Amino acid sequence: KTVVVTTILESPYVMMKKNHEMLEGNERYEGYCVDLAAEIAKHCGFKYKLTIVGDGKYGARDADTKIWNGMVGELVYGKADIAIAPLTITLVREEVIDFSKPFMSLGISIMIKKGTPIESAEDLSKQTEIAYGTLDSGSTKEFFRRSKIAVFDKMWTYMRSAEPSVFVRTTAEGVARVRKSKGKYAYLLESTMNEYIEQRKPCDTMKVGGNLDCKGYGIATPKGSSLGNAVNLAVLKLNEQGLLDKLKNKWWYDKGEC
Ligand SMILES: N[C@@H](CCC(=O)O)C(=O)O
Numbered sequence: 001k002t003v004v005v006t007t008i009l010e011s012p013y014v015m016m017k018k019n020h021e022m023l024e025g026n027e028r029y030e031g032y033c034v035d036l037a038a039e040i041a042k043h044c045g046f047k048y049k050l051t052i053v054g055d056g057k058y059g060a061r062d063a064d065t066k067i068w069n070g071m072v073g074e075l076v077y078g079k080a081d082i083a084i085a086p087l088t089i090t091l092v093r094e095e096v097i098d099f100s101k102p103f104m105s106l107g108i109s110i111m112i113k114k115g116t117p118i119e120s121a122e123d124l125s126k127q128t129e130i131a132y133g134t135l136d137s138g139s140t141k142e143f144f145r146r147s148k149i150a151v152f153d154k155m156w157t158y159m160r161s162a163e164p165s166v167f168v169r170t171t172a173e174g175v176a177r178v179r180k181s182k183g184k185y186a187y188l189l190e191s192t193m194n195e196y197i198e199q200r201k202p203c204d205t206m207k208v209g210g211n212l213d214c215k216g217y218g219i220a221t222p223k224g225s226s227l228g229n230a231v232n233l234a235v236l237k238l239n240e241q242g243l244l245d246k247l248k249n250k251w252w253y254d255k256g257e258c
Pocket of ligand 1: 058059086087088089134135137138139140141188189190
């Protein structure tokens, strides 16, 4: 009867508490999604075990083998009951799993080292001296692969064959790469994560341009699962109560450094 919660380490959604060497199970982690977890549980009614996805990925279906990896996979292949993390709600995913009403909104955005000669996605697509990429197995990559919009199509045609690879394994790798590339690498990632990093020392990154799209994160559960209707109801209620906004103040604004 214990629901197993699959999630991923992504600041400030899920972070290792500073004294993680000890404290067991769910007491080891902290962050927005951890708090959201508890709330959903207390409101929906049930206990849960927080588990960090093995492959540390969000979720992509290998075109060749039609096999889903990451959190989406662990949901489609009975390895987890519910996914509570910043998992983007998308068309292709809504065909093999179920999402609640979004609990937070976001859009793809651009992160550059301060002083980089880039002010927009169009700027990036009209030059080549500055490389750029996204997270390897997430929705941002797939957004570009699929885009029909001229600019993003052009950006994708560049990214897929870019050498060396512009794709990263984690958000931290993308960010690091932006910081250690002397203004020669731009990173495309979701605004939520982009804005968090922007308010954290060394305060050398920046967000330029507007969001490239509008999307939402949602609690995910297996097709026709048992919690489906409940969680959506819990989410709508927390949204109603205004508790999701408060969690946002807690983890984003009340912790700026620049
Ligand atoms: N939120 C994305 C991961 C981050 C990204 O793709 O930029 C997903 O659920 O795949």
